[PDB]
Design a protein around this ligand. Structure first.
Ligand SMILES: CC(C)Cc1ccc([C@@H](C)C(=O)O)cc1
Length: 133
């Protein structure tokens, strides 16, 4: 159930993140900073409002949203996007759209770990998170 996403998650593995960021036009200097920290993601809920916080040395971000209701978002890399978060079976799907393109940030729980798959065209990144106690 949706509740299994709630809590505090720490990055423990990454594949293809530099490649995903390059695919979004993030410059090398910014990619180096973004890749050299293990971020923390906090997923919270109050009524039908979900909040996702990312804490890192690169940027702190916070978004709030209702499932299935489009919202304006300014991403960590300063893209102004049109976003929506949905639940597709066990997948919490964050879609970002801008300028005729899109990216998805998909979260799934596998063996108690939070797997974040970031897709932008042929660039696919896997970020693996573990729950903090
Ligand atoms: C283009 C990038 C900078 C957008 C971005 C993707 C993933 C994260 C968090 C979840 C992360 O896993 O580091 C933060 C920002």
């Amino acid at each position: 159930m949706v509740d299994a996403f709630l809590g505090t998650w720490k990055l423990v593995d990454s594949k293809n993140f530099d490649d995903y960021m390059k695919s979004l036009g993030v410059g090398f200097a910014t990619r180096q900073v973004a890749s050299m920290t293990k971020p923390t993601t906090i997923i919270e809920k109050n009524g039908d409002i979900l909040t996702l916080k990312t804490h890192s040395t690169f940027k702190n971000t916070e978004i709030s949203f209702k499932l299935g209701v489009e919202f304006d978002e300014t991403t960590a890399d300063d893209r102004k996007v049109k976003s929506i978060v949905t639940l597709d079976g066990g997948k919490l799907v964050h879609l970002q759209k801008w300028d005729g393109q899109e990216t998805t940030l998909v979260r799934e729980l596998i063996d108690g770990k939070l797997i974040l798959t970031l897709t932008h065209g042929t660039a696919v990144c896997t970020r693996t998170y573990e729950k903090e106690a």
